[PDB]
Design a binder for this molecule. Structure first.
Ligand SMILES: O=C(O)Cc1c[nH]c2ccc(Br)cc12
Ligand SMILES: [Ca+2]
Ligand SMILES: [Ca+2]
Lengths: 440, 420
């Protein structure tokens, strides 16, 4: 719809704002609405960003916004409120009468919190008195990377002294002094570094804490992020990423696993973006292509339901309503319509052990509810967990429960113990798979 | 790029992002011998002359024929136009990769990669077609939403479903409500009503083209596609998945209505998957086809596919070239008579099927099942002797399996070593 900030209408509308993010989607835009006399909520996926906007508004313009994050909450009364999706979700969502305008910044984000948070805004904002929701991103669905004036991009050839994802890095260009290199996994961040900390070029691997630079060559996963020492002269990109996916493996039910894929445009623009910051920069790549942005995996829907039940006190049917509003809204990332299936499985998961759930939550496991629940049925059948990986630590108490086969609900990682596939909850999920997933 | 690249002085690869004959004639006026490649040379509408019809400086052929001809012959062309270069069928990908690898050595000075739908393309509005979201209100349940009887009672309508089974079930529900509903899917008669009267065609993505009326299209916005699973049981599985449709698919389904007269498009999902990626099973297909059809050693197939993957502006895929090249290299001594048979039957992976049958016949062991795929072995009696030496899964497996054939172990090792 808009490449500029949409005016406030007289009846509720959902507007799309597609703008370069240097143009202050998170600063200039909410400030313009504020100057007009509106109360504006600004949502972002990351805690750092949210605090980072608050600071900039206090320092560069003397405006002290409300800040709302899990770790810290500041209330000044300013018409501008900065919050994370997660904190917005924990706050219970849209507070009646609070906001005239809600900006969903980085609306391209496909982590579970962002999707459930935006779904919630689209379900609730009109009823709560907002006149206008703005879905703001620099990279709408279908976006590909465009050229950058102060970054020249050069294909790697197979000629060179370092083996790199089927191609070669000529020894020179990483002796310029100032370099970031992206590898898909941890295991090959060491192996790649060590294949030249032993060669002496001086290199360190990131995935822990920070350890770098004013020379140096950093090789890291995506666990480093967009800021820090923006001075690099070149980036070298393997152009692939590790993503979470669900397999309906029927063994007995589903598996959450990881796949290595070609990077999408969001990934490529961002990795390339850590050079050419003022200076001229060079981008070197294994592969010229990229998936367009705008698709996400059904395993992320699973996560939304997991967080609904674990963090936000949402019955699955309520999470479905929020996600349904997301899925019905045009110009947002798309996924398989598996709402019925996941509402289905989580609704069958009754009488979870509160102590286990309040152990997996603190642990930072990805699916605290699913984990605590498998552990729940394990304890009550006096069976062992599916393995003695760290995920299952809430059960340390091998001793009574080592009685036999694990009653396996689903696969969240590697399964080491022998299993039994006949538990009523397992049969229940299988029936939900028949009921709610299509065939052929 | 929107306009036809002027012929340069050295060899290069250009991209023509043209919207929905055009350009080739222009290059032919200038003395240039041009070759134009498509998936098919049949009339794009389903009616009219073939593209190869003579009236020459311009040849019209297909990627399939081009590959069978052995690719680029001599200095026979200055300009090669790869049209519909967004196509991700195996023949198109191997065909384009062949052009890119051979064109310059064959003395061509320009390769045009033309498509109306570059990577990242999204479906755009149609001046002539009104689009309306289905609600959950209506008599006919449809992929989680509902079709109201009112919008298909009377008139002519096309409903897309993702499978044969869904088409039968939906048509039966319509007929029971008094609608003249007809199921269409491959294997059928174009018995879609002859005429002009009310009809609701319930169809898969068979039926292309055609000649229907259709005041409206209703779209499930779902597709079925082929995927490889690296399932370690023992090795990999070729399977079929349902995914959200991509922009190509939505545009094409919506384009059955609003031809001339205004039309109405009704949908289950507002969004599509952006176009521009394909599965690793397609790579596997390319090597299979290289070995069965085109007499290509796996390393020759790799060379062509690598050229494709180094070329910007084309659909992307996982880099499994070394993996697939490695498994086909191990597949030695295939039974020739079996390969002939799976080639004639139109199996999707004739080399892989025949090779599994070759391993069965030698161990005098039965096929993984007695589905039609395995009928080269049908001289059955001596062979049912025990477990199946299972190399990979190309379908459902009914027989008892054994996982210790050396070729199974070989492929497992390729998986360990070539797949991260
Ligand atoms: O920590 C944040 O502010 C974001 C967030 C992500 N997930 C959350 C769950 C609860 C609460 Br409170 C907050 C979050
Ligand atoms: Ca699978
Ligand atoms: Ca699998």
């Amino acid at each position: 719809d808009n490449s500029s900030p949409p005016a406030v209408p007289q009846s509720f509308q959902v507007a799309h704002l597609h703008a370069p993010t240097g143009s202050g989607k998170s600063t200039k835009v909410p400030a313009a609405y504020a100057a007009q006399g509106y109360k504006v909520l600004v949502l972002n996926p990351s805690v750092a960003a949210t605090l980072g906007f608050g600071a900039y508004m206090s320092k560069a313009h003397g405006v002290d916004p409300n800040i709302r994050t899990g770790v810290r909450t500041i209330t000044t009364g300013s018409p501008i409120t900065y919050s994370t999706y997660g904190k917005f979700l924990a706050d219970g969502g849209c507070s009646g009468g609070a906001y005239d305008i809600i900006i969903c910044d980085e609306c391209h984000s496909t982590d579970a919190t962002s999707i459930l948070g935006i779904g919630t805004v689209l379900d609730q904002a009109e009823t709560a008195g907002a006149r206008l929701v703005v879905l703001a991103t620099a990279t709408p669905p279908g976006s590909v990377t465009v050229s950058h004036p102060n970054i020249e991009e050069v294909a790697l050839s197979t000629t060179g002294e370092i083996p790199f994802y089927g191609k070669a890095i000529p020894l020179e260009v990483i002796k310029g002094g100032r370099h970031l290199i992206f590898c898909h996994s941890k295991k090959k961040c060491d192996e790649l570094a060590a294949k030249l900390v032993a060669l002496g070029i001086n290199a360190v691997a990131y995935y822990l804490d920070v350890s770098v630079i004013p020379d140096v060559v950093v090789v890291s996963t995506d666990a480093l992020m967009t800021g820090f020492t923006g001075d690099f002269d070149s980036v070298i990109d393997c152009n692939t990423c590790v993503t979470q996916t669900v397999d309906f493996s029927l063994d007995p039910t589903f598996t959450i696993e990881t796949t290595t894929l070609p990077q999408d445009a969001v990934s490529r623009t961002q990795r390339r973006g850590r050079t050419g910051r003022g200076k001229p920069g060079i981008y070197r790549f294994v592969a010229p292509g990229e998936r367009p942005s705008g698709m996400f995996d059904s395993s992320v829907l699973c996560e939304c339901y997991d967080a609904g039940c674990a963090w936000y006190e949402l019955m699955p049917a309520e999470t479905t309503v929020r996600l349904r509003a997301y899925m019905n809204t045009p110009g947002l990332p798309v996924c398989q319509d598996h709402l019925e299936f996941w509402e289905g499985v989580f609704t069958g998961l009754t009488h979870i052990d509160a102590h286990f759930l309040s152990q997996t939550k603190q642990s930072g496991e990805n699916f605290p509810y699913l984990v605590a629940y498998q552990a729940t049925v394990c304890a009550r059948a006096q069976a062992p967990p599916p393995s003695w990986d760290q995920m299952w630590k809430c059960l340390i108490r091998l001793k009574p429960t080592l009685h036999g086969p694990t009653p396996l609900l689903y696969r969240l990682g590697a399964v080491q113990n022998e299993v039994t596939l006949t538990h009523p909850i397992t049969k229940y999920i299988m029936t939900c798979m028949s009921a709610d997933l299509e065939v052929v």
